[PDB]
Amino acid sequence: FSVFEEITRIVVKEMDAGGDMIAVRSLVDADRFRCFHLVGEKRTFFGCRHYTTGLTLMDILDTDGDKWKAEFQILDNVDGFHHQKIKISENRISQQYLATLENRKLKRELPFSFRSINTRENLYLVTETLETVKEETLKSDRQREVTIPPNRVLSYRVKQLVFPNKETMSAGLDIHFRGKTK
Amino acid sequence: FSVFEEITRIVVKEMDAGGDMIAVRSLVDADRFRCFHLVGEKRTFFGCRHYTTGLTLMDILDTDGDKWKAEFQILDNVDGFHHQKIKISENRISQQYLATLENRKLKRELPFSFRSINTRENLYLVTETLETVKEETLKSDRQREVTIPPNRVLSYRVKQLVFPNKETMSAGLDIHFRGKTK
Amino acid sequence: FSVFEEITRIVVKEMDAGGDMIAVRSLVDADRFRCFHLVGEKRTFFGCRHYTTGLTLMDILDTDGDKWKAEFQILDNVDGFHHQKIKISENRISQQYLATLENRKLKRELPFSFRSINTRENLYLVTETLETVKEETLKSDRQREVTIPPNRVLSYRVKQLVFPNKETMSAGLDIHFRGKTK
Amino acid sequence: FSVFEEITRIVVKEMDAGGDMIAVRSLVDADRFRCFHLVGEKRTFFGCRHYTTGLTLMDILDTDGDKWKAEFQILDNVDGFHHQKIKISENRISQQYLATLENRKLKRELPFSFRSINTRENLYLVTETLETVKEETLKSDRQREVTIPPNRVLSYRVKQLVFPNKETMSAGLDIHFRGKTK
């Protein structure tokens, strides 16, 4: 019935066949589920299905930390029957920029410590921007043909980070098996 | 038979498939069921069906607290048979604005303390505005084709807050299991 | 057979599905069954069917107490077979205005004390104006197609008030279970 | 179902029938999986299928190390049924340039030592550039006809290198049997 899971997993599959990429479920905050954001805890009910909570993560702006690929198209159908008309835009971001962000000093008092400690979800971040400013409508059959605004994201990446009390570290080997001591 | 539950749950489902969002039942006060408002107590008769009472919550205006996405469309049908022609407008509101509202001092003498104590419904608030200034008519079959004025809301969010005698606190982890000591 | 109950309950149902709202039976005094008015005692013969008596309630005018939504339309049919062509006008009235009316001093010698004591109906008032200045004719089948003048009301609300000998109080939690000691 | 494996292995087969060449799985970073890059560890699940991680390897630029074939076409189909419309560009790079790169001094502090030691994947490099600036769409049947942006790579080569603590050496005899002591 649902269409966004189908579209995001089509992106993920043709993006790399059953690989590293992760899809998103909610567009309550999809476009603002950009880099420096979170995701709900993972459960296995009705297949691989997690929760959704992706609040902000920018901490400081003292050193250069906010400095700034062509259009891509997916116009096909899947035999229920689905029809996808996606267009994708890519803003290249450097990988050593991730190291720079790790070097950035972690210091905030945003009301996020309470929820983060209560969850212990060991939040992870994206690697490189995946953006869509595409058209509205897609199609699905069980009819219900969904509609999508421009400037929205579909799939995201993993870079595990650990948060001690004051300053953080990194776990880059795609660690999302929910095991930590924080 | 009823159409508004169908329309709001269609919004909720295609908004995120059976997820966090909550629909509304009454348009007695729908547009004025904006942020800073309430909802009736939850019961399980005829499925998930709650009551409806969403009175005002603005308390003080001393610091900046009243400062101020493109159009979205849903034009489909569901196989009874229903037909939806919804248009949606979005006014972006910041998430740290919720923290600012929590920091706002709670002080009122509005005749709401009596009803709030008699109910103990642990009221919860919305996250980001969901507005519709769309057309009038929709369609349904058992015929009865409903009509909807502009500048109205359909679905809302959760941010639990606890009210001690003088000043309040927050319960952000989507807590709506009606358990408190106030 | 009767049509006004059908029309008012259609208003109530699509107004909120089997919820707080209350319909009216008689148009002997419908338009003047505005705010500050009464209703007959409730009985359970032939379903939920009450009496009708809604006389005046204005008491004093010393402080500001008489200071002063767009058009709505319902153009459908119900499968007997009924056909409704209602238009509705709304004059917004504040909720803290109800608190102001409660603060208003109660003092009258209108010949209403005798009937009120003989009835003990614990009269209740409306919340916000519901007005119709719509067209005349509707349709019904068992034919008999009813006609309705402009500037008339269909459904009303509840705000229970208790009347001691001199000054009154409030019972806001939609209390209409006919229990009091006055 | 998957199409990129088919296309890359078609390249590999007609490039040399079941020979030295290696195909890639992910286009998360395909174009930037150029020379001086990595690959995920090799496993044998669902046939020959490895992981994917190809981060950067440039170390120093002091001596000449960044100084700088006609178009090729593959327009056929394979009897499921597939249809390929590939165009290929080649930028010739010298083989003694590989010796020069080996002579280049290895010295970096990029956050890659941790992941490299944790993996022990004994990374290997390409021999000569294989580039495609071709059209978008291909075709496949189980329909799903994939799309490909210009300036992207499909297949790559092997030149094993060993990394001691400070300075590296070479293992040129196409050694990718994951055996080392580093």
Side-chain angles (χ1 to χ4, degrees), chain D residues 19-51:
Chain D
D20 186 74
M21 295 299 102
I22 298 89
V24 74
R25 204 81 200 90
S26 297
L27 73 163
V28 184
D29 203 61
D31 179 61
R32 187 268 187 189
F33 291 153
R34 212 190 70 73
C35 187
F36 294 100
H37 292 330
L38 279 79
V39 68
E41 46 271 11
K42 321 166 300 294
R43 275 314 309 128
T44 57
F45 91 99
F46 190 29
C48 290
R49 271 302 315 119
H50 313 167
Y51 293 98

Side-chain angles (χ1 to χ4, degrees), chain A residues 93-107:
Chain A
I93 186 75
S94 180
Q95 283 59 23
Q96 51 87 30
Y97 186 67
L98 271 48
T100 305
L101 306 162
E102 186 46 60
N103 196 5
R104 303 286 269 201
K105 183 68 176 66
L106 265 294
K107 178 173 180 177

Side-chain angles (χ1 to χ4, degrees), chain A residues 10 13-17 21 69 71-79 84 95-96 99 157 173-174, chain D residues 1-2 4 25-29 32 111 115 118-119 136 142-149 152:
Chain A
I10 282 168
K13 282 188 176 181
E14 270 73 354
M15 184 47 257
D16 62 357
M21 295 299 102
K69 185 263 289 180
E71 188 65 32
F72 190 97
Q73 62 84 29
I74 293 296
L75 277 296
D76 286 353
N77 49 1
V78 180
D79 57 354
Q84 54 275 8
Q95 283 59 23
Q96 51 87 30
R157 277 72 54 197
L173 288 92
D174 310 346
Chain D
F1 184 76
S2 46
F4 272 13
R25 204 81 200 90
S26 297
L27 73 163
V28 184
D29 203 61
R32 187 268 187 189
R115 191 265 181 190
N118 222 315
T119 55
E136 208 69 30
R142 188 270 302 277
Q143 297 298 325
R144 173 81 247 179
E145 62 261 14
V146 296
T147 68
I148 294 90
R152 311 278 100 91

Side-chain angles (χ1 to χ4, degrees), chain B residues 1 4 28 34 46 69 83 85 93 116 122 127 156 175:
Chain B
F1 184 76
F4 272 14
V28 184
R34 212 190 70 73
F46 190 29
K69 185 263 289 180
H83 289 81
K85 284 87 165 181
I93 187 75
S116 69
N122 58 38
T127 301
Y156 53 85
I175 300 161

Side-chain angles (χ1 to χ4, degrees), chain B residues 1-2 4 25-28 32 111 114-115 118-119 136 142-149 152, chain C residues 10 13-17 21 69 71-79 84 92 95 99 157 173-174:
Chain B
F1 184 76
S2 46
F4 272 14
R25 204 81 200 90
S26 297
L27 73 163
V28 184
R32 187 268 187 189
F114 200 91
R115 191 265 181 190
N118 222 315
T119 55
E136 208 69 30
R142 188 270 302 277
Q143 297 298 325
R144 173 81 247 179
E145 61 261 14
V146 296
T147 68
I148 294 90
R152 311 278 100 91
Chain C
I10 282 168
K13 282 188 176 181
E14 270 73 354
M15 184 47 257
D16 62 357
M21 295 299 102
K69 185 263 289 180
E71 188 65 32
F72 191 97
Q73 62 84 29
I74 293 296
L75 277 296
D76 286 353
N77 49 1
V78 180
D79 57 355
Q84 54 275 8
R92 299 176 61 183
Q95 283 59 23
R157 277 72 54 197
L173 288 92
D174 310 346

Side-chain angles (χ1 to χ4, degrees), chain D residues 52-70:
Chain D
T52 311
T53 297
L55 268 64
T56 185
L57 283 178
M58 281 56 68
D59 45 45
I60 66 172
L61 182 60
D62 51 355
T63 307
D64 177 73
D66 288 331
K67 65 102 174 179
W68 292 119
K69 185 263 289 180

